[PDB]
Amino acid sequence: SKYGGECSKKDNTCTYRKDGKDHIVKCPSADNKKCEKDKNKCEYDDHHKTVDCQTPV
Ligand SMILES: [Cl-]
Ligand SMILES: [Cl-]
């Protein structure tokens, strides 16, 4: 369901691992979902069809 990765602050992207490959998606522009911290945990949720670059730690 959920595929983890790390985010790029400069690009506001999430690079997530899914089925043995890396996939680069834009994070949201939303204040509390954008990549705030370089290399922060992000997730692509394939159930909800969402990206979050502020994954709860
Ligand atoms: Cl997009
Ligand atoms: Cl999204």
How many angstroms separate the CA atoms of 26 and 33, rounded?
Answer: 11
Residue 57 lies in a domain: no
- The technique by which this structure was obtained is X-ray
Residue 37 lies in a domain: yes
Tokens of residue 15, six digits: 């690079």
* Amino acid of residue 19: D
What distance in angstroms lies between residue 9's CA and the mean position of ligand 1's atoms?
16
**Residue 26's CATH number:** 2.40.50.60
Domain residue limits at 34: 2-52
Q: How distant is the alpha carbon of residue 45 from its chain centre?
A: 9
3-state helix, strand, coil split of the chain in percent (to 5) is 0, 45, 55
- 11 part of a folded domain: yes
Residue 23 lies in a domain: yes
Establish if 14 belongs to a structural domain. yes
Domain count, the chain: 1
Residues 28, 8: Cα–Cα separation, whole Å: 12
Q: Minimum-distance ligand to the CA of 26?
A: 1
Which ligand is closest in space to the CA of residue 12?
1
**Cα–Cα distance, 47 to 54 (Å, whole number):** 18
